[PDB]
Nucleic acid binder design. Structure first.
Ligand code: NA
Length: 320
DNA sequence: CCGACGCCGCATCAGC
DNA sequence: GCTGATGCGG
DNA sequence: GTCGG
């Protein structure tokens, strides 16, 4: 892209803030700067030019000046070569190893996947699965495979109980040509906010050998691993989440987990101006002093659009 | 100057 | 044994 | 690190 040197620099800085410095708000600051620069339709000539963008401040402008003048950043060159920092940063690519775990491992001399393989007893269940599928989890999922995955999920859900409703959300629902994982939202008329269901669906997908491993599982959220059946070479293992949501909150949930994140904030902003508060679960009216009323009945995504006097937006048009 | 920056389900640890 | 905190993912 | 009350 037009400013890929800069945006790669900022993303690498973001990762070290999150994984080594444990400074999550600086991680997000660098990511926001990388995003606003990525959308800038000109090749940046100076830090001052970039500082005019929201999310780029004095320090990032200085780094851009150093990068444009010299082609590198001294601080990033240094931490790249740092054995301890580079190893901590790397180990967080294992699902289940966060900044805390990565630091503890490197402190005791465990720095590579091979060290992890030699030290299984030090890994919890999630981390063992993350190590097992390290390469597969970093591959993207082509839309054609997402469609084949959706076929299986919708068929098996309906087989368990034809009154379930299931919706694959995420960027797939907005029409993306590839995905990072699969996000399934599930509800059933017997399950309301006022009124088992998840277990039966997980069990059925395990019985037909679609779900292969479980990272976590409770009464309303499943996180695990699945794999399309092989004809041929085998398909990569993929991350799949399944969320059970009360029926009266289902379409707020589908809206939220379809996104995009940008579209979500724009819709929430607009709802506020019309006197409503929308979150993942509900839409509620706000009184004249800002007191939220009871959740309003929502029986489709369009009900939410109708409340705030927006024309219905198709998922494919929810990029912003 | 200084606090916000999203929040929650699940696994697991720290502590009683 | 239970309760609450933390880590983690997203 | 950046923004803004
Ligand atoms: Na700044």
């Amino acid at each position: 892209t037009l400013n890929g040197g800069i945006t790669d620099m900022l993303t690498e800085l973001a990762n070290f803030e999150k994984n080594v410095s444990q400074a999550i708000h600086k991680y997000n600051a660098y990511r926001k700067a990388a995003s606003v620069i990525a959308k800038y339709p000109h090749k940046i000539k100076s830090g001052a030019e970039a500082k005019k963008l929201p999310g780029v401040g004095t320090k990032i402008a200085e780094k851009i000046d150093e990068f444009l003048a010299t082609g590198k950043l001294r601080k990033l060159e240094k931490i790249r070569q740092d054995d301890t920092s580079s190893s901590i940063n790397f180990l967080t690519r294992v699902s289940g190893i966060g900044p805390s775990a990565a630091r503890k491992f490197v402190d005791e001399g465990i720095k590579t996947l091979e060290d992890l393989r030699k030290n299984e007893d030090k890994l919890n269940h999630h981390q063992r699965i993350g190590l097992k599928y390290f390469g597969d989890f970093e591959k993207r999922i082509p839309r054609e495979e997402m469609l084949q995955m959706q076929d299986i999920v919708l068929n098996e859900v309906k087989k368990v109980d034809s009154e379930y409703i299931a919706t694959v959300c995420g960027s797939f629902r907005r029409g993306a040509e590839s995905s990072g994982d699969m996000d399934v939202l599930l509800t059933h008329p017997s399950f309301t906010s006022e009124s088992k269901l998840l277990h039966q669906v997980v069990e059925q997908l395990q019985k037909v050998h679609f779900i292969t491993d479980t990272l976590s599982k409770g009464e309303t959220k499943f996180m695990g691993v699945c794999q399309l059946p092989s004809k041929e070479k085998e398909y990569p293992h993929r991350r799949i989440d399944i969320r059970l949501i009360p029926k009266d909150q289902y379409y707020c949930g589908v809206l939220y987990f379809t996104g995009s994140d940008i579209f979500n904030k724009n819709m929430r902003a607009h709802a506020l101006e019309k006197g409503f508060t929308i979150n993942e679960y509900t839409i509620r009216p706000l009184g004249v002093t800002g007191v939220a009323g009871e959740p309003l009945p929502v029986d489709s995504e369009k009900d939410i659009f109708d409340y705030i006097q927006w024309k219905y937006r198709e998922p494919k048009d929810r990029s912003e």
